[PDB]
Amino acid sequence: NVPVTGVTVNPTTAQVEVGQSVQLNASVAPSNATNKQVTWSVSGSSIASVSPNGLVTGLAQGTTTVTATTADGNKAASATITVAPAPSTVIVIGDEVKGLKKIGDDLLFYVNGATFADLHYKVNNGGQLNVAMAPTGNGNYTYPVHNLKHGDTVEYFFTYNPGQGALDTPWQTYVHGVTQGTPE
Amino acid sequence: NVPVTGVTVNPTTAQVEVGQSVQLNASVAPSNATNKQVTWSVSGSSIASVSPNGLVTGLAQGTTTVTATTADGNKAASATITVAPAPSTVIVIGDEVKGLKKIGDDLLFYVNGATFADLHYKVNNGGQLNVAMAPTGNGNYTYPVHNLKHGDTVEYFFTYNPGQGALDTPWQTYVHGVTQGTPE
Amino acid sequence: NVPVTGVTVNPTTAQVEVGQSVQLNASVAPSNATNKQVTWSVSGSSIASVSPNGLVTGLAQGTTTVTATTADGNKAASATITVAPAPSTVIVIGDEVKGLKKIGDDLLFYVNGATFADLHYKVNNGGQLNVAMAPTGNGNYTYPVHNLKHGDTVEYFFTYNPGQGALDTPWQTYVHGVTQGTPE
Amino acid sequence: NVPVTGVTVNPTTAQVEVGQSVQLNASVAPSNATNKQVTWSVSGSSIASVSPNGLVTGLAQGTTTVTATTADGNKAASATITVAPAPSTVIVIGDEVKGLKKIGDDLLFYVNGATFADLHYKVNNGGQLNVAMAPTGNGNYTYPVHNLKHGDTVEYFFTYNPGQGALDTPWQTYVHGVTQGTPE
Ligand SMILES: [Cl-]
Ligand SMILES: [Cl-]
Ligand SMILES: [Mg+2]
Ligand SMILES: [Mg+2]
Ligand SMILES: [Mg+2]
Ligand SMILES: [Mg+2]
Numbered sequence: 045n046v047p048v049t050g051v052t053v054n055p056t057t058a059q060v061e062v063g064q065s066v067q068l069n070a071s072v073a074p075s076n077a078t079n080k081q082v083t084w085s086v087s088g089s090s091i092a093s094v095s096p097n098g099l100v101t102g103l104a105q106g107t108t109t110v111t112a113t114t115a116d117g118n119k120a121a122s123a124t125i126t127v128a129p130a131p132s133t134v135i136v137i138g139d140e141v142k143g144l145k146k147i148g149d150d151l152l153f154y155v156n157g158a159t160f161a162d163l164h165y166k167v168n169n170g171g172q173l174n175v176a177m178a179p180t181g182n183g184n185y186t187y188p189v190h191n192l193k194h195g196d197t198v199e200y201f202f203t204y205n206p207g208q209g210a211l212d213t214p215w216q217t218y219v220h221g222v223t224q225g226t227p228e
Numbered sequence: 229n230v231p232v233t234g235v236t237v238n239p240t241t242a243q244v245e246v247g248q249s250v251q252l253n254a255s256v257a258p259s260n261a262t263n264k265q266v267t268w269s270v271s272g273s274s275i276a277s278v279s280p281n282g283l284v285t286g287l288a289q290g291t292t293t294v295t296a297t298t299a300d301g302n303k304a305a306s307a308t309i310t311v312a313p314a315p316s317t318v319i320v321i322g323d324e325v326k327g328l329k330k331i332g333d334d335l336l337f338y339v340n341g342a343t344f345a346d347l348h349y350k351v352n353n354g355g356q357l358n359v360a361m362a363p364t365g366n367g368n369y370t371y372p373v374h375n376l377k378h379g380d381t382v383e384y385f386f387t388y389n390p391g392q393g394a395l396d397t398p399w400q401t402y403v404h405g406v407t408q409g410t411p412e
Numbered sequence: 413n414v415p416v417t418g419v420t421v422n423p424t425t426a427q428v429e430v431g432q433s434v435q436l437n438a439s440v441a442p443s444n445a446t447n448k449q450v451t452w453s454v455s456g457s458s459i460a461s462v463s464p465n466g467l468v469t470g471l472a473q474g475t476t477t478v479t480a481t482t483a484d485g486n487k488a489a490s491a492t493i494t495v496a497p498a499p500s501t502v503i504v505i506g507d508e509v510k511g512l513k514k515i516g517d518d519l520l521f522y523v524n525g526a527t528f529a530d531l532h533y534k535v536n537n538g539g540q541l542n543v544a545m546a547p548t549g550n551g552n553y554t555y556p557v558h559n560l561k562h563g564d565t566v567e568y569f570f571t572y573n574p575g576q577g578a579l580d581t582p583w584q585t586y587v588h589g590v591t592q593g594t595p596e
Numbered sequence: 597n598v599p600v601t602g603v604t605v606n607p608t609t610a611q612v613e614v615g616q617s618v619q620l621n622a623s624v625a626p627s628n629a630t631n632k633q634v635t636w637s638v639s640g641s642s643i644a645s646v647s648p649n650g651l652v653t654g655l656a657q658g659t660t661t662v663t664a665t666t667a668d669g670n671k672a673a674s675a676t677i678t679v680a681p682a683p684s685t686v687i688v689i690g691d692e693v694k695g696l697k698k699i700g701d702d703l704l705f706y707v708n709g710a711t712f713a714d715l716h717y718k719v720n721n722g723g724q725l726n727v728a729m730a731p732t733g734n735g736n737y738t739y740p741v742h743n744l745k746h747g748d749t750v751e752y753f754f755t756y757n758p759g760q761g762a763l764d765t766p767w768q769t770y771v772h773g774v775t776q777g778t779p780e
Contacts, residue, residue, distance in 0.1 A: 170379025195354025538747025563722025
């Protein structure tokens with residue numbers, strides 16, 4: 045009855061971090077068009093996901109094109125979504141003796157003041173990994189875990205000897221981009 | 229007191245799949261060296277992990293070097309670990325109406341015989357994403373989820389209308405490299 | 413028909429290696445419809461590219477959807493494209509003293525029978541990198557270069573001591589997935 | 597003759613961008629020690645490369661451990677090196693009609709004020725790809741190329757129609773992390 049003459053998407057560009065969402069809106073012309081329904085699509089779906097209502101969620105580093113197409117007339121408009129890297133901001137989770145630093149998408153596990161330090165860790169429902177932590181050269185130890193994604197659940201404990209004799213710590217649970225710590 | 233004169237690492241090369249392990253052995257010479265301690269290290273810890281006992285675990289595609297160094301004398305030997313891509317052999321986890329195909333590290337969700345299909349999923353402790361599944365053009369629908377890791381836990385269901393009206397399927401859970409299906 | 417009534421894409425599923433191409437064709441319904449022009453699109457452009465004439469090139473591992481949309485009527489059909497990874501074969505490029513093995517997308521540089529080996533290399537218009545090659549324990553050396561992609565251009569030479577004294581080899585050029593060598 | 601007793605790595609932590617370098621140095625205890633030779637190793641070589649003289653180069657985002665081991669004593673110390681992502685800062689390379697935006701490690705090719713736009717590009721010694729650029733909805737066009745690394749050589753031109761005839765722009769060359777443009 046009142047045909048669509050056009051569509052625009054707002055915002056026309058947005059930056060999100062991996063795991064963050066932005067709501068897009070399709071503006072259909074004329075404003076009294078009978079059928080304002082749109083299909084949302086993305087040309088780079090490993091970068092960004094789009095819901096049936098234009099909610100865009102960053103999945104990985106990159107820039108992609110979200111398009112809205114009118115059910116009436118197949119007019120199409122698009123926005124550019126940039127998914128930005130995790131900031132390299134160091135977030136510390138634990139105490140003076142042990143814990144981890146979040147450094148973008150790597151975790152740096154640390155044990156301070158020992159004879160040796162091992163790390164026991166598991167990621168989501170994969171297997172346990174037992175590793176020797178690297179000596180810094182001063183009684184301190186470090187071990188980087190690489191390339192975590194948003195939602196990755198890491199269970200981890202240490203075996204170390206701070207003098208008395210070898211002890212195991214209680215397993216902690218860390219969720220990538222959900223567990224909070226204190227900045228730099 | 230008997231000094232270490234050499235070390236060999238066996239096997240000298242090995243291919244594993246991601247999340248598969250292989251036990252290396254360090255042979256310290258001579259057999260009656262008084263210190264037979266070795267440290268295991270990996271030059272490429274993104275690709276494979278090594279335990280203090282030489283258990284090497286494939287983490288991601290590529291080739292790396294695991295070295296054994298003697299505590300006595302710093303004698304060194306090394307092995308080549310090749311971590312092989314997930315095979316592209318199509319495994320079906322589902323039935324004739326809906327489910328997924330595992331195709332290497334991507335999952336292709338499918339719904340057959342509907343007027344529309346949506347997918348509701350979540351990976352690990354990430355947020356639920358809602359997508360419209362892409363029509364093939366014959367009343368069937370697909371939607372790929374890209375780049376899963378060994379242990380990644382996908383929880384999912386569908387909304388579709390096979391004639392009588394929209395219904396939701398029950399929550400299913402897939403664990404990447406663990407959940408089994410029908411190698412079709 | 414003057415009008416278009418439907419479209420199907422032929423083939424409906426296809427697999428290529430990264431680097432390879434598959435021609436898609438759109439079967440426009442009415443056998444002899446007026447306008448048989450389609451728009452080709454891809455929902456996973458990291459994985460596969462599609463030409464205006466429906467040629468699909470694999471860019472990176474994964475599975476994606478390529479759609480043809482009719483100019484007349486905006487009928488849409490789609491094909492599933494699987495891009496398989498470089499198989500972890502071993503291709504030798506060199507002689508019995510030095511060269512590299514191509515192992516899927518990593519290169520294993522080797523020098524056999526030396527008192528030390530350095531590798532000097534450069535990838536595309538990137539900077540020169542100098543590395544000490546890891547000793548395997550028997551006067552041989554290896555060094556893996558990780559995650560090369562199709563068309564990556566590597567210039568390399570070695571400094572090693574075969575006993576007589578240090579020499580430099582002549583620079584060689586390798587082009588990833590173009591330069592060939594000795595299979596198995 | 598004066599032996600070795602210890603080593604520290606200077607600096608003990610450092611951050612670079614992908615493509616960039618930081619010189620590490622081993623401080624060997626006794627500072628008059630006759631043999632100050634170290635071996636440099638890195639545990640995550642996908643992330644960062646180390647020269648036989650302790651120059652570390654960032655190759656890919658993440659955090660890794662670079663170790664110095666004394667030739668005399670094989671005492672060892674470690675530095676933590678963070679490789680930070682190419683910032684998602686928009687650099688415009690082109691003019692008001694056509695060019696590209698560098699947005700982290702993705703390039704967004706654009707053509708403004710056309711009835712259609714195609715992009716012809718080639719990465720390094722890979723194949724030339726042809727793509728229909730995606731219309732924004734206003735007579736402008738866009739097409740992202742994804743996940744370039746430092747030194748990647750992109751040769752491109754455009755076919756577009758500014759109103760009265762398709763024309764081809766001349767070949768341009770972009771060198772990722774080398775070609776400069778104007779920030780935002
Ligand atoms: Cl993609
Ligand atoms: Cl690595
Ligand atoms: Mg895209
Ligand atoms: Mg390595
Ligand atoms: Mg896709
Ligand atoms: Mg590391």
